[PDB]
């Protein structure tokens, strides 16, 4: 409708205008008659809660001009006695009580001696109140009137003036209990179908109720002991006695927010035991979270003593929240976890130091999850969402992942999760383990981490299943790379053991995996092999350590070999050979010779492509050429075996290149006979170039024939200028002649020109032609 309101405010402004008119003209009772008829305007009630409220606030503001008028009058001494009796002539209860409050506060100001008596009267006679709307607005007027003048402790105490802080406290608690009664009574008045309207209106009025607590809080007298003994005992008596939920919850959060934590800390177990008896339909969770948030901002609030050690917050709150959960019957487990998250945050921020607390947290979370007969929680469940948000907090907050390995009870948490979520989180954690460089680990914790890796590399949707996905796969390697790196920073004796557990682990890796994982391990072996020789003084079994580790490498390599691979094992034998060569230990030649024959075997057996041949032989020659530990009895077999194998190849072009490459084998070929230098028998070098020449004379391809002569010519120059006396200048002349008598017979091509440039540069450099 909304008209009632404007018409009413019109009539109100009329009567309060004629009211203030009579009050300036100083004929009081006529003003009080207009004021009375005006408050008669409040006898309509159909107004909206908001509308009625505005009319109320309007009339209160006009009454303020009256209150200051009276206050002045009494301060001027012009006081008429017995005002309550004369005013009780007003036939209705409403004028009487508006008059009583108004004159009461004036007398209290003017007669502080009368304060106790007037308050005790007003508090006792308000028990008459039974109607919700007018009673509410009256007791609000009471609350605003009582804003400041109530007894207090730092107040002048005239033994005529009676009333103390205890009296003020009793005053407000009593008026509160009566108003809250009417307000809850508001739940059931009217028809049961206005319940949402009713609850909306009450929600609107909740601030009216909380204003009592605001009033209680400005009371200077509120010491911790009064808070302990009086305030909470009264409030908890009504709360436990009211067994409602909407009001209790609102009022209790307002308390939480309002009072200082100093008072709360002295009154926690009473307040939390009270919290535990509350109604089941209550979202206690949001309350508790608000509480946790307030004590968290209280923990890291500095400019304070910190947490007194006698105050074992965690044990207290833990046991009471626990009691609250027992008191709760239908808790969503997700809600339990949302609280567990805040329980983490608290333990984390107040005591990073004390891990046993965190473990007690993990044990209670675990016990919760076990009593829950839950399967590995899929992506859809909010429960997994929460468990994720919970667990990442230790994961995110504990910068050092080594510290996690001090928590044995963490690993049990992996169990409850889905494989997909385990995979996501395991990626998240290990990524954190690399981002936060957390380094070389204790063996047992190395074990448990390796157990975690074994779960990553061995499990699939939530069991090992191959449902193939075209997607990346190489996210798992770099991680292991890092692991392996930090692993090597132990002392010598630890590595063999760590190496063995790493070995078994990768043995359990698979077949689709190990090709990329083991190479780093190979380099590990090498560096430690280097460590043993560089430390050949304080160790006497270092040569033995080298032998065992090289045997270890051989098996590991053979492991890679069974996967039916070629390239990698070939290279791993080369690197191992080189290492043993540099170490030069006892039996080192024999070991190297063994490692070599494995390499040769791989070469023959695992020989595939022309390109692959050239690459394999180039690697064999480069490794072979600097190897110098073998004496002629050992150097010579391999030497001839290599010469023949090489001379067997596929393609004549490549054939000529290889045969020419072999020269170096006859020149760099240095064995332990005359103590590492080559005997320098020009003759075998000559025969080598001879076969190369023969192959040239057979190629019969202009373009390639010429190109090959220019290379072999340059090669000749290298050895002539390398003082191979056998290289006569006469041979070079006869051949250059042949090359001259052939060079013209060419078409135009991109190469022939470059071959000319090469040749011209070559003749221009040397000057000895």
């Amino acid at each position: 409708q909304e008209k009632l309101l404007d018409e009413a405010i019109q009539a109100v402004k009329v009567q309060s205008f004629q009211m203030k008119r009579c009050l300036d003209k100083n004929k009081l009772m006529d003003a009080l008659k207009h004021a009375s008829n005006m408050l008669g305007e409040l006898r309509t009630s159909m107004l909206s809660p908001k509308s009625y409220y505005e009319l109320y606030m309007a009339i209160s503001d006009e009454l303020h001009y009256l209150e200051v008028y009276l206050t002045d009058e009494f301060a001027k001494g012009r006081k008429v006695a017995d005002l309550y009796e004369l005013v009780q002539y007003a036939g209705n209860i409403i004028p009487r009580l508006y008059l009583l409050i108004t004159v009461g506060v004036v007398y209290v100001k003017s007669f502080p001696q009368s304060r106790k008596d007037i308050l005790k009267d007003l508090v006792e006679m308000c028990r008459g109140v039974q109607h919700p709307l007018r009673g509410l607005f009256l007791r609000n007027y009471l609350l605003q009137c009582t804003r400041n003048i109530l007894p207090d402790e730092g107040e002048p105490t005239d033994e005529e003036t009676t009333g103390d802080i205890s009296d003020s406290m009793d005053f407000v608690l009593l008026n509160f209990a009566e108003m809250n009664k009417l307000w809850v009574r508001m739940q059931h008045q009217g028809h049961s179908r206005d319940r949402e309207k009713r609850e909306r209106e009450r929600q609107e009025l909740r601030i009216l109720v909380g204003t009592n607590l605001v009033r209680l809080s400005q009371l200077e007298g509120v010491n911790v002991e009064r808070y302990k003994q009086i305030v909470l005992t009264g409030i908890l008596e009504q709360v436990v006695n009211c067994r409602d939920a909407l009001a209790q919850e609102y009022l209790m959060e307002c308390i939480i927010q309002v009072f200082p934590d100093e008072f709360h800390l002295q009154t926690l177990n009473p307040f939390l035991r009270a919290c535990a008896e509350l109604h089941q339909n209550v979202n206690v969770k949001n309350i508790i979270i608000a509480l946790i948030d307030r004590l968290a901002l209280f923990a890291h609030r500095e400019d304070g003593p910190g947490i007194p050690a006698d105050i074992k917050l965690f044990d207290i709150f833990s046991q009471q929240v626990a009691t609250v959960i027992q008191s709760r019957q239908d808790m969503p487990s997700e809600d339990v976890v949302s609280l567990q998250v805040s329980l983490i945050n608290l333990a984390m921020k107040c005591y990073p130091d004390r891990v046993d607390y965190v473990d007690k947290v993990l044990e209670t979370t675990v016990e919760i999850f076990n009593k829950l007969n839950l399967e590995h929680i899929a992506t859809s469940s909010a429960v997994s969402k929460e468990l994720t948000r919970l667990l990442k907090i230790p994961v995110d907050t504990y910068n050092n992942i080594l510290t996690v390995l001090k928590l044995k009870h963490f690993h049990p948490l992996f169990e409850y999760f889905d494989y997909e979520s385990r995979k996501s989180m395991s990626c998240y954690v290990l990524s954190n383990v690399l981002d936060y460089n957390t380094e070389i680990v204790s063996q047992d914790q190395v074990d448990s981490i390796m157990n975690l890796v074994s779960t990553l590399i061995q499990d699939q949707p939530d069991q090992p299943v191959e449902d193939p996905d075209p997607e990346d796969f190489a996210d798992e390697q770099s991680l292991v790379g890092r692991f392996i790196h930090l692993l090597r920073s132990e002392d010598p004796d630890q590595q063999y053991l760590i190496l063995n557990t790493a070995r078994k682990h990768f043995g359990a890796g698979g077949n689709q995996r190990i090709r990329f994982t083991l190479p780093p391990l190979v380099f590990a072996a090498y560096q430690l092999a280097f460590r043993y020789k560089e430390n050949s003084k304080v160790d006497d079994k270092w040569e033995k350590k080298c032998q065992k580790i090289f045997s270890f490498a051989h098996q590991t390599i053979s492991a890679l070999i069974k996967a039916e691979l070629a390239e990698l094992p070939l290279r791993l034998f080369l690197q191992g050979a080189l290492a043993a060569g540099e170490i030069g230990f006892e039996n080192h030649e024999t070991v190297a010779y063994e490692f070599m024959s494995q390499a040769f075997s791989l070469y023959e057996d695992e020989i595939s492509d022309s390109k692959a041949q050239l690459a394999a032989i180039t690697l064999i020659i480069g490794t072979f050429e600097r190897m110098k530990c073998f004496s002629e009895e050992n150097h010579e077999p391999l030497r001839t075996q290599c010469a023949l194998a090489a001379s067997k190849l596929l393609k004549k072009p490549d054939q000529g290149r290889a045969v020419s490459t072999c020269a170096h084998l006859f020149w760099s070929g240095r064995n332990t006979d005359k103590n590492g230098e080559e005997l320098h028998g020009g003759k075998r070098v000559m025969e080598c170039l001879k076969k190369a020449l023969k192959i040239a004379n057979q190629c019969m391809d202009p373009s390639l024939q010429v190109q090959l002569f220019i290379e072999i010519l340059n090669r000749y120059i290298y050895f002539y200028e390398k003082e191979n006396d056998a290289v006569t200048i006469q041979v070079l002349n006869q051949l250059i002649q042949k090359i001259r008598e052939d060079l013209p017979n060419l078409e135009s091509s991109e190469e022939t020109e470059q071959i000319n440039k090469h040749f011209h540069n070559t003749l221009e450099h040397l000057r000895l032609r």
């Binding site: 480069g622 290298y718 450099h765």
Partner: protein
């Protein structure tokens, strides 16, 4: 224009990344060219490179996974004709005479190669030879003491100034070397 020359990163075979300080020196915008000798190995390292600049040139190293890279390549940079090869194809491995023999065939003014993991910048018979080394100080059986490093050259015109970046101790020492066409 200035070009960046690096290689033999060997990630993740022997190293996990470039030294901390070096990463702080290689930022986008400055580099217009990148010639990579070595086997960075993982495509992960190719992308990072693709960050510092857009025109990247890579040759196949003896341990690179992708076989699609060139054994050797010749790229022209202004007045300069530059060759690129990893080095393992040059026998003996770091032999100047063998590198030189290679220079003739390519017909380049400057020849970039790695494989030895030892920085080298020198002139020989009017030609220039550069070996960046290993940007990650990657392990190498032949040399027990490897020093991280890369090298960016600045070409104005028929004149090059190559800056060698070594990681000795904590600080990053530097050295200047100039070369100009004959």
């Amino acid at each position: 224009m200035l070009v960046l020359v690096l290689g033999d990163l060997h990630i993740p075979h022997r190293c996990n990344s470039l030294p901390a300080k070096f990463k702080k020196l290689l930022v986008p915008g400055k580099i217009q060219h990148i010639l990579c000798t070595g086997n960075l190995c993982t495509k992960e390292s190719y992308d990072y490179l693709k960050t510092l600049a857009g025109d990247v040139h890579i040759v196949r190293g003896d341990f690179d996974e992708n076989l699609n890279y060139p054994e050797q390549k010749v790229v022209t940079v202004g007045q300069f004709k530059i060759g690129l090869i990893h080095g393992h194809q040059v026998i003996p491995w770091g032999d100047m005479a063998s590198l030189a023999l290679l220079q003739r065939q390519f017909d380049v003014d400057i020849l970039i190669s790695g494989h030895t993991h030892k920085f080298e910048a020198f002139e020989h018979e009017n030609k220039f030879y550069i070996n960046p080394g290993s940007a990650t100080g990657a392990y190498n059986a032949l040399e027990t003491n490897i020093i991280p490093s890369f090298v960016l050259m600045d070409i104005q015109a028929s004149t090059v100034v190559t800056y060698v970046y070594q990681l000795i101790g904590d600080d990053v020492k530097v050295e200047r070397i100039e070369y100009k066409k004959p």
